[PDB]
Amino acid sequence: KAEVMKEVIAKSKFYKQERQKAQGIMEDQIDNLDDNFEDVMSELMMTQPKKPKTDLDKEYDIKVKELQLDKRAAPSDRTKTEEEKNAEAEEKKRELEQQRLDRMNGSISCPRTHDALLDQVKKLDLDDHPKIVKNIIKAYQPKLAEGNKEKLGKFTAVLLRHIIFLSNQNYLKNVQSFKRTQNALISILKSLSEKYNRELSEECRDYINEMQARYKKNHFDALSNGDLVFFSIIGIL
Amino acid sequence: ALPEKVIKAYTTVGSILKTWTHGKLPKLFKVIPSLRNWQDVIYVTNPEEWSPHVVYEATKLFVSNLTAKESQKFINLILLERFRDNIETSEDHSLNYHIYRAVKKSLYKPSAFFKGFLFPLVETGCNVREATIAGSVLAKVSVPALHSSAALSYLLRLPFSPPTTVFIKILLDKKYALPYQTVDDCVYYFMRFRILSNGEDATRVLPVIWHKAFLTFAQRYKNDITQDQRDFLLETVRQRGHKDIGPEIRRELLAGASR
RNA sequence: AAGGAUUGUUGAUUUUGUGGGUGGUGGUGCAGUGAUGCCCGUUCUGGACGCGCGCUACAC
| Interface residue B145 vs chain A (CB under 8 A) | yes
Q: Is the CB of B37 less than 8 angstroms away from the CB of A26?
A: no
Q: Is the CB of B212 under 7 A from strand C?
A: yes
Q: Calculate the CA A151 to chain-centre distance.
A: 13
| Interface residue B23 vs chain A (CB under 8 A) | yes
Candidates B199, B200, B188; CA nearest to B236 is B188
On chain A, the residues whose CB falls within 8 A of the CB of B248 are none
Cα–Cα distance, B172 to B161 (Å, whole number) = 17
Q: Is the CB of A75 less than 8 angstroms away from the CB of B221?
A: yes
Stated in angstroms to one decimal place, the resolution of this structure is 3.0
CA of B85, closest CA in chain A: separation in Å? 25
Q: Is the CB of B242 under 7 A from strand C?
A: yes
Q: Is the CB of B144 under 7 A from strand C?
A: yes
Across the interface, of A57, A59, A75, the residue whose CB is closest to B177 is A75
Report the residue count for chain A: 237
Residues 6+ apart with CB under 8 A from B225: B183, B187, B233, B256, B258, B259
In the stretch 206-235 of chain B, residues with CB closer than 8 A to chain A read 219-224
Residues 6+ apart with CB under 8 A from B72: B111, B112, B115, B116
In chain B, positions 6-65 with C-beta closer than 7 Å to nucleic chain C are: 21-22, 60-61, 64-65
CA of A58, closest CA in chain B: separation in Å? 11
> Taking the alpha carbons of B89, B91, B94, B97 in that order, is the dihedral positive or negative?
negative
What method did the depositors use to determine the structure? cryo-EM
Please report how the helices A225-236 and A175-195 are oriented relative to each other, as an axis angle in degrees rounded to 10.
Answer: 40
Q: Is the CB of B181 less than 8 angstroms away from the CB of A70?
A: yes
Q: Is the CB of A30 less than 8 angstroms away from the CB of B26?
A: yes
Strands (E) in chain A, as ranges, are none
Whole-number distance in Å between A87 CA and C32 C1': 39
Identify any residues that bridge with A72 across adjacent strands, giving them in sequence order. B179
Identify any residues that bridge with B179 across adjacent strands, giving them in sequence order. A72
At residue A187, the 3 state secondary structure works out as helix
